[PDB]
Amino acid sequence: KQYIISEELISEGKWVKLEKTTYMDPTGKTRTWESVKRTTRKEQTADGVAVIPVLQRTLHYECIVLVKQFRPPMGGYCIEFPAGLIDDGETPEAAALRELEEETGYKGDIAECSPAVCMDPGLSNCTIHIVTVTINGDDAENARPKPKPGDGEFVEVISLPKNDLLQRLDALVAEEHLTVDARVYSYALALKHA
Amino acid sequence: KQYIISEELISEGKWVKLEKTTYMDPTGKTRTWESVKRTTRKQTADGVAVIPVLQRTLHYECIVLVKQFRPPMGGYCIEFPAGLIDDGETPEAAALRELEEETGYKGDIAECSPAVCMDPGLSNCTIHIVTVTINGDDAENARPKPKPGDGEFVEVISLPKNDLLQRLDALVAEEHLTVDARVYSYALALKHAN
Ligand SMILES: COC(=O)[C@@H]1C[C@@H](O)CN1C(=O)c1ccco1
Numbered sequence: 001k002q003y004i005i006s007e008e009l010i011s012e013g014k015w016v017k018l019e020k021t022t023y024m025d026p027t028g029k030t031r032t033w034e035s036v037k038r039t040t041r042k043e044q045t046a047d048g049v050a051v052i053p054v055l056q057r058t059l060h061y062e063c064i065v066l067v068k069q070f071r072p073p074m075g076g077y078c079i080e081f082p083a084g085l086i087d088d089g090e091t092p093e094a095a096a097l098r099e100l101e102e103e104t105g106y107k108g109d110i111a112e113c114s115p116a117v118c119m120d121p122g123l124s125n126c127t128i129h130i131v132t133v134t135i136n137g138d139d140a141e142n143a144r145p146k147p148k149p150g151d152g153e154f155v156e157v158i159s160l161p162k163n164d165l166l167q168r169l170d171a172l173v174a175e176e177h178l179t180v181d182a183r184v185y186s187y188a189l190a191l192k193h194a
Numbered sequence: 195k196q197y198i199i200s201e202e203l204i205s206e207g208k209w210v211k212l213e214k215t216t217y218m219d220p221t222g223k224t225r226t227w228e229s230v231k232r233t234t235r236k237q238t239a240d241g242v243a244v245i246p247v248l249q250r251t252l253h254y255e256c257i258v259l260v261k262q263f264r265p266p267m268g269g270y271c272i273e274f275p276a277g278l279i280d281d282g283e284t285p286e287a288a289a290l291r292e293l294e295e296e297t298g299y300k301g302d303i304a305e306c307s308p309a310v311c312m313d314p315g316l317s318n319c320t321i322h323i324v325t326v327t328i329n330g331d332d333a334e335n336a337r338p339k340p341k342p343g344d345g346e347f348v349e350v351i352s353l354p355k356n357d358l359l360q361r362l363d364a365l366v367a368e369e370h371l372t373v374d375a376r377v378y379s380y381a382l383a384l385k386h387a388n
């Protein structure tokens with residue numbers, strides 16, 4: 001019943017634009033919305049990937065590998081799944097493994113790959129694939145893992161046990177000003193609930 | 195080590211603005227970021243999202259979700275019930291209100307996240323994730339009455355918690371819908387637990 005009638009550019013940066021979106025409501029009436037989009041999306045099936053990296057090691061509880069970085073939009077440090085935009089021609093899987101290595105040093109193995117999922121669909125068209133990767137922490141490749149941060153990338157690795165993820169996140173939030181990402185919090189809540 | 199120096203307004207709508215953020219990178223080099231912010235924040239966070247468990251005896255527990263046309267997305271999305279927190283409303287009260295408006299269900303608060311970020315590489319948007327249980331055997335949730343605001347058009351989709359990820363993949367396969375990243379993350383962790 002509902003559909004887009006027109007998308008009018010309001011303001012375009014190098015990376016992000018704002019649009020006036022006109023669409024048809026399900027009563028047959030024309031309405032508008034203010035929409036955000038990235039300028040970087042080409043033929044990618046989504047803007048980006050986020051990696052759920054399950055670190056597995058003999059006689060250790062499984063950990064979820066997270067990253068902490070300063071996020072200018074937020075004016076502060078955030079704790080997130082490793083993530084980045086998908087390069088043109090790159091597959092979501094390749095992007096996930098590459099970003100995981102760049103941000104954490106770990107070399108993972110693909111487990112699963114989501115369909116494209118929406119980041120904040122009342123605001124933006126941004127989408128990611130959520131890629132689950134296992135990391136064999138008993139492999140020598142993953143023994144002394146060093147981030148390969150790109151230019152202006154400064155990332156800290158935080159590995160937390162899956163079996164206590166929500167409380168460990170709460171403890172980090174209790175101890176400094178930082179924001180946990182909504183996907184990470186959602187994943188930790190489901191762990192607790194299951 | 196990192197911090198905001200200045201924010202330059204690029205463009206301001208009624209609901210969203212685009213800024214150019216200047217910040218200090220950890221080497222001591224000054225850098226810029228294009229950032230989105232909402233114009234509506236006053237609040238602990240911009241919004242709430244509700245994780246609503248429909249608990250009925252002799253039935254599977256269900257997670258209650260909503261499907262709506264999302265103009266930024268150009269299509270229909272499957273999401274946790276959600277909306278912006280009114281000036282002077284608590285996140286818990288917003289959560290019960292939105293859940294009732296969007297689903298007709300009347301629920302009880304179980305727990306409340308701290309403010310969590312939506313897409314911190316792009317925006318400052320935050321929400322509280324509010325876990326709510328719904329006693330599906332109570333008379334008030336027998337024939338749930340959804341009270342949409344102006345221009346909201348919301349379908350309710352309840353899915354069993356124990357098979358949430360498979361059920362969501364199936365809807366994406368069959369219905370050409372976009373699942374929300376937070377919903378998908380929760381669903382993943384229900385499978386990944388233990
Ligand atoms: C153990 O029984 C429960 O009901 C747990 C405990 C409480 O934290 C909420 N909860 C959920 O499972 C839930 C609510 C929404 C989605 O899941």
Ligand SMILES: [Mg+2]
Nearest residue numbers: 082083084103
């Ligand atoms: Mg990244």
Ligand SMILES: [Mg+2]
Nearest residue numbers: 083084099102
């Ligand atoms: Mg990166």
Ligand SMILES: [Mg+2]
Nearest residue numbers: 275276277296
């Ligand atoms: Mg809503």
Ligand SMILES: [Mg+2]
Nearest residue numbers: 276277292343
């Ligand atoms: Mg609403």
